[PDB]
Amino acid sequence: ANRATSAFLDNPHPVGVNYVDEGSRQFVAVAELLASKLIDSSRESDESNSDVPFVQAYSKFADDNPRHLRVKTGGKMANALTNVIRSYYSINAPAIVPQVEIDRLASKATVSGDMYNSYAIFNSVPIVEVLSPARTTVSIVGSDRADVTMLNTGAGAANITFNFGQIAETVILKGSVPFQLARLNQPMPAARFTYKLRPLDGPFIVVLPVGNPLVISATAATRIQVPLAFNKALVESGFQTAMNDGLFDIQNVNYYSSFDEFIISQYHAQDGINRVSTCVILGLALQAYDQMRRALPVR
Amino acid sequence: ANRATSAFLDNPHPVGVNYVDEGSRQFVAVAELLASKLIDSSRESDESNSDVPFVQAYSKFADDNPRHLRVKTGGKMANALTNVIRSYYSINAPAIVPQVEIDRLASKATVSGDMYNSYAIFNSVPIVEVLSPARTTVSIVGSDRADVTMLNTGAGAANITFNFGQIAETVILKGSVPFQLARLNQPMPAARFTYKLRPLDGPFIVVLPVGNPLVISATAATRIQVPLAFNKALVESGFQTAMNDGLFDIQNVNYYSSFDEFIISQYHAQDGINRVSTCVILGLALQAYDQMRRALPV
Amino acid sequence: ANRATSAFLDNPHPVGVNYVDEGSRQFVAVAELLASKLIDSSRESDESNSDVPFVQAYSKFADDNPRHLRVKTGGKMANALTNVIRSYYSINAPAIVPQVEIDRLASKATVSGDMYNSYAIFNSVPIVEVLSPARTTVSIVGSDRADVTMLNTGAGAANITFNFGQIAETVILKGSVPFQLARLNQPMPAARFTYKLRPLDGPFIVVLPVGNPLVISATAATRIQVPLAFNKALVESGFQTAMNDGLFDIQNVNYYSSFDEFIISQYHAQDGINRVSTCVILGLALQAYDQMRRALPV
Amino acid sequence: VGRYYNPFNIDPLTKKHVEDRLEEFINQVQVGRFRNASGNAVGTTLAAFLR
Amino acid sequence: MDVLSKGSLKELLAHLEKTPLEEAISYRIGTVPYQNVLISRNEYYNQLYPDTTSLIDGVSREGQRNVNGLIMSIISYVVSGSGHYIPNIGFMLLRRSILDILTKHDTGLVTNNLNYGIIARNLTVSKMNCEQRKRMLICFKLLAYKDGNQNDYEIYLNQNIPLKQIAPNFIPGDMRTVIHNQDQLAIVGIPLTQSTELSIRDDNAKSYKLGYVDWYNSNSFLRERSEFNLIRLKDRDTKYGKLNGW
């Protein structure tokens, strides 16, 4: 038997275990709120041709007044947020932010630190394993939509089993040509183009007739609890900024093309429940990091 | 001759025929307006450290004062919204919402029921049929970006016919290596990497040489009239939520990975205009469903 | 030796050199601001059961009162915005909007017109060239996520060189099976599923074993300076509308499936910095064109 | 650019006192018993002055 | 700076009648016209900004000694404000006005063999705005009617459809057309922040724009001091020595 699996699900590195208490989550919540006001004030300043709205917003965020010849970098709040983001990503990242700093910045605004008000839908498709007989070839490509190319070289029809884990809520399979798919110890229905499957049903067997290759396009949707201020578009941009800025360069860590793949990969691991809670906080922090950096740019 | 067809264009299922009249369209519009204000009041309450904005918004939506030790489901409007969404998806689904209830909920706000004021661009790539001669292999994979794998094991060059339908407005073809494409009874141009075509121009013939596989990536844009409040990002979120919540489970219905595929497949089937009219109403209802469920999980 | 190149990077056409001064930039920023107000006013008019908010917004935008019998087109500001979009795309566009018209339209609202106070991330992956030896097949498919399919048919393992240009910030490579990649004049590490690279590091060599094909999926991120009002969701939708409306129908021009591919392709041309500034202005213009046309369809 | 505490602990956004239970608290004082075990006007007098 | 502020065909033609050819030409060598160069724009980029030099930039460049060179210098002055370096033009030509060089036969210059398509390519008409193209077509039409090559002007316009749309609607012989013309040919004018533009043409054009407000007030006294007791150069009486090389 030959085995294939999704590339992004391999070896999820551990996440940080620091700044996950009530005070720290409050600080990240405050950072997102003040970063959002920084972006809005910059727009209000530009349509109004006055620097007053931006100066006031920066003063709340950085606890200091902007001065010429000094680069506006966000002050102590930006420094704490950047180092905290590193700590969330990996367990090898240091913890160098004192508690008195977290408490001071958390008090700057009165917002709730609860990170489970709402939910979000994540599109990464988890393919844990695909097992095929000896005379068959299977290739898995993609994370937002997985294309599984299967070729049968032997004389007889082959049976290929699909495992989608137990985390995803729905998986939709579409084939280039109609194909047969059924659960274990179940009769195989007529060949169809699409299937809607619940991954908890069990391994799924697909008959691969000898001849032209069969390609299956997989789409999955999973629901993760997130704070009501969670915006997926901002989080993805913040994830790319952090990767480009070089603050995800830690020893013995994995790298992902999006925050979607990062959160799903951590979910599909041992003690995956606890990792997802830390990753959600990191997502909101990445939202704050994105908005702050766009408001105060560097070349 | 071998025929290749897109997976999501095969056998669309009938859509609902209820909750289409003017009063019903007002209800969907009011639900979208009230649900949006609910999520804004959620943000404002957090910033201002007071629950007054949320209490006012929820009272308007659910016709009930929020109380502790309650699930905060959403009231009659949430139940009406959920049952109406089921009705649109299939003609088999029951219509269990009385008309008097819909009109009463439609009176909570003064908005127009017009659903064709604005437009939206939908990105699904319709490939109705790809016709190839013998000794050649053709495979079609993908919906948002369709990749067509093409191999010629014959002695000479082959002509392969593409048919993108009539609904789509523009189609852009990008090849792995430069290739040759022209309409029927037209001279073949020089090898080029990219082509821009109007699908109404007719079937397109592509010359496949004998050497190495040719892969053609296709992107299409289609315009569908929608209300001005339409938001594609929010509609997609609602579509995945309704599917996960089990609002689309019924006998004899096709299942699609996105609202993009749903509306385009419904367009290409017989009696296309009326189906898209109902699908657009489902989009606004799905948009309202996403915001109300994200504000009030249950 | 064979060469493989991404389709969307081939032969970028020269962009327009007009309407890129401070006065013209202010006009584009003014158009975006007033187009946004036009959309919000339509929503307010529907909610308030009145036409006063929309009449004020349309009058400011078009310098004329709305009329029931006449069609709502946007007036001279719509025509100027349409024409500058054509001029931005190609150097062969007429560029027939007078300077006096632009100055009078930029005086309606107060904006800085600065297109360098923020940034945005563009996800197109540039693969300038892939060098492969004999008895090897390489195919590249995709622009937002590039899949490189490699087949080895020779006696031994082959060395395949990847060149990702010198502009993209980071590149992440994920293979179907673990594989080996290293920079020039460097030892090869153990087989791994993922690789994070800087294109400035240099050409990368990938060892391809004899046997099953190896597929490498590529994802890249690039940072480009954009105005603070830049919205990628609106820019991409406006790009599709302009293509459907025929604003880019000019002789001797290339075509792209998205605005992301357009800007990255122009970045990678000879002296691509010359074109990025003009491409960003076109994006902001396409943002205003989207919001205006959705409010006032034609 | 400066900052100053709003007089009398009133939030301009809410247009009321910072404490959201002031009406309930005043009524609690009115129906309370203070300084004596028997009835007195301490609760009622303080409620009138507070209002 | 004065030639760029003229916003009517009447004012532009009046200026050319008053201005001698000396201010159309320049006495500075400059550099080669067409060349790929890297320029420093530190307001935006740390790296050097690529650009191509041309004859439309308000900077002097080397020009050959022929009628084509003289015509190119005149048009560049009209559409950009600065001319070119043509060595040793001669007193007789420098004392004549720009309009007489374009529209009169007594200057001693032959212009019957001018090719309009080549001049537009050499002047880089592609990188011109609407106002500059109109001014170039005014100079072309004046030369066309002077030598009788009115047909060639129409052939050139037919080959370039975008230029045909914005072509001037005046006949050089007639005066009713000039009086009733409604074109807007102003390039510089009183309104812009003291900032730097990326392109050479855009930066130089903005320099003229920012300096026009100051030039509006300071030129009056400084000019009058220069020619307080000076004989006008335009059409200066002389012994009519010779015209060499033409």
Short mmCIF file of C-alpha atoms in Angstrom, two decimals, chain C residues 64-175:
data_model
loop_
_atom_site.label_atom_id
_atom_site.label_comp_id
_atom_site.label_asym_id
_atom_site.label_seq_id
_atom_site.Cartn_x
_atom_site.Cartn_y
_atom_site.Cartn_z
CA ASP C 64 -26.95 68.38 -12.21
CA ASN C 65 -30.20 67.39 -10.57
CA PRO C 66 -31.55 63.88 -11.19
CA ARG C 67 -34.45 63.67 -13.61
CA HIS C 68 -37.00 60.88 -13.95
CA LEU C 69 -37.07 60.88 -17.75
CA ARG C 70 -33.32 61.33 -18.23
CA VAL C 71 -30.88 58.52 -17.50
CA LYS C 72 -28.51 58.71 -14.54
CA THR C 73 -24.97 58.46 -15.92
CA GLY C 74 -22.87 60.52 -13.50
CA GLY C 75 -22.33 63.48 -15.80
CA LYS C 76 -18.92 64.75 -16.82
CA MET C 77 -17.17 63.15 -13.85
CA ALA C 78 -18.17 59.70 -15.10
CA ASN C 79 -16.86 60.47 -18.59
CA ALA C 80 -13.55 61.80 -17.26
CA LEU C 81 -13.09 58.78 -15.00
CA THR C 82 -13.88 56.40 -17.86
CA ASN C 83 -11.39 58.11 -20.18
CA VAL C 84 -8.47 58.23 -17.73
CA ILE C 85 -8.91 54.49 -17.11
CA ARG C 86 -8.35 53.83 -20.81
CA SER C 87 -5.33 56.15 -20.81
CA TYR C 88 -3.80 54.42 -17.78
CA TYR C 89 -3.91 50.97 -19.38
CA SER C 90 -2.03 51.57 -22.63
CA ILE C 91 0.22 54.20 -24.19
CA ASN C 92 -1.89 54.03 -27.37
CA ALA C 93 -5.03 55.34 -25.65
CA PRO C 94 -6.20 58.77 -26.87
CA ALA C 95 -5.85 60.63 -23.53
CA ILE C 96 -8.42 63.26 -24.48
CA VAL C 97 -9.46 64.75 -21.12
CA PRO C 98 -8.47 68.44 -20.84
CA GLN C 99 -6.38 69.67 -17.94
CA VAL C 100 -8.93 72.37 -17.08
CA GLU C 101 -11.59 69.69 -16.64
CA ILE C 102 -9.40 67.74 -14.21
CA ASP C 103 -8.51 70.77 -12.07
CA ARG C 104 -12.15 71.80 -11.72
CA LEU C 105 -13.08 68.26 -10.70
CA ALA C 106 -10.28 67.97 -8.14
CA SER C 107 -11.51 71.11 -6.37
CA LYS C 108 -14.80 69.51 -5.31
CA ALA C 109 -13.34 67.73 -2.27
CA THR C 110 -10.13 68.17 -0.29
CA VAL C 111 -7.73 65.23 -0.58
CA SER C 112 -3.94 65.01 -0.55
CA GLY C 113 -3.64 62.73 -3.57
CA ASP C 114 -0.72 60.90 -1.95
CA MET C 115 -0.33 57.36 -3.28
CA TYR C 116 2.56 56.36 -1.02
CA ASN C 117 1.26 56.49 2.58
CA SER C 118 0.29 52.80 2.87
CA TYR C 119 0.95 49.38 1.36
CA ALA C 120 -0.89 46.28 0.19
CA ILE C 121 0.09 42.64 -0.33
CA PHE C 122 -0.22 41.09 -3.80
CA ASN C 123 -0.29 37.31 -4.02
CA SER C 124 0.84 36.57 -7.59
CA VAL C 125 3.82 34.21 -7.72
CA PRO C 126 6.51 35.20 -10.26
CA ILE C 127 8.34 32.28 -11.90
CA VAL C 128 10.63 33.97 -14.41
CA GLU C 129 12.29 30.79 -15.68
CA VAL C 130 12.62 27.11 -14.78
CA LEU C 131 15.67 25.44 -16.31
CA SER C 132 15.41 21.68 -16.81
CA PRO C 133 17.77 19.19 -18.47
CA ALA C 134 16.98 16.69 -21.21
CA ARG C 135 14.47 13.88 -20.64
CA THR C 136 12.56 16.02 -18.12
CA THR C 137 9.11 17.61 -18.46
CA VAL C 138 8.18 20.79 -16.57
CA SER C 139 4.79 22.51 -16.66
CA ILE C 140 3.64 25.59 -14.71
CA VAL C 141 -0.06 26.25 -14.08
CA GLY C 142 -1.63 29.09 -12.12
CA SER C 143 -0.87 32.67 -11.11
CA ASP C 144 -2.20 33.02 -7.56
CA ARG C 145 -0.97 29.52 -6.66
CA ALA C 146 1.52 28.06 -9.13
CA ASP C 147 1.86 24.29 -9.51
CA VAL C 148 5.09 23.06 -11.11
CA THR C 149 4.72 19.49 -12.37
CA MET C 150 8.06 17.78 -12.96
CA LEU C 151 8.67 14.35 -14.50
CA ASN C 152 12.04 12.60 -14.71
CA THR C 153 12.62 9.96 -17.38
CA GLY C 154 16.42 9.75 -17.42
CA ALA C 155 18.79 7.31 -15.78
CA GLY C 156 19.68 9.41 -12.73
CA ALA C 157 18.47 12.29 -10.61
CA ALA C 158 18.17 15.66 -12.33
CA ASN C 159 18.90 19.20 -11.17
CA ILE C 160 16.17 21.73 -11.93
CA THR C 161 16.82 25.45 -11.40
CA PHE C 162 14.11 27.85 -10.21
CA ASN C 163 14.34 31.62 -10.70
CA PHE C 164 11.76 33.66 -8.79
CA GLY C 165 12.94 37.09 -9.86
CA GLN C 166 14.29 39.76 -7.55
CA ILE C 167 11.12 41.62 -6.49
CA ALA C 168 8.92 39.22 -4.51
CA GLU C 169 9.44 39.31 -0.76
CA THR C 170 8.91 35.69 0.30
CA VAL C 171 8.14 32.44 -1.52
CA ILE C 172 6.71 29.33 0.15
CA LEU C 173 7.05 26.01 -1.68
CA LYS C 174 5.04 22.94 -0.67
CA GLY C 175 5.49 19.70 -2.56
#
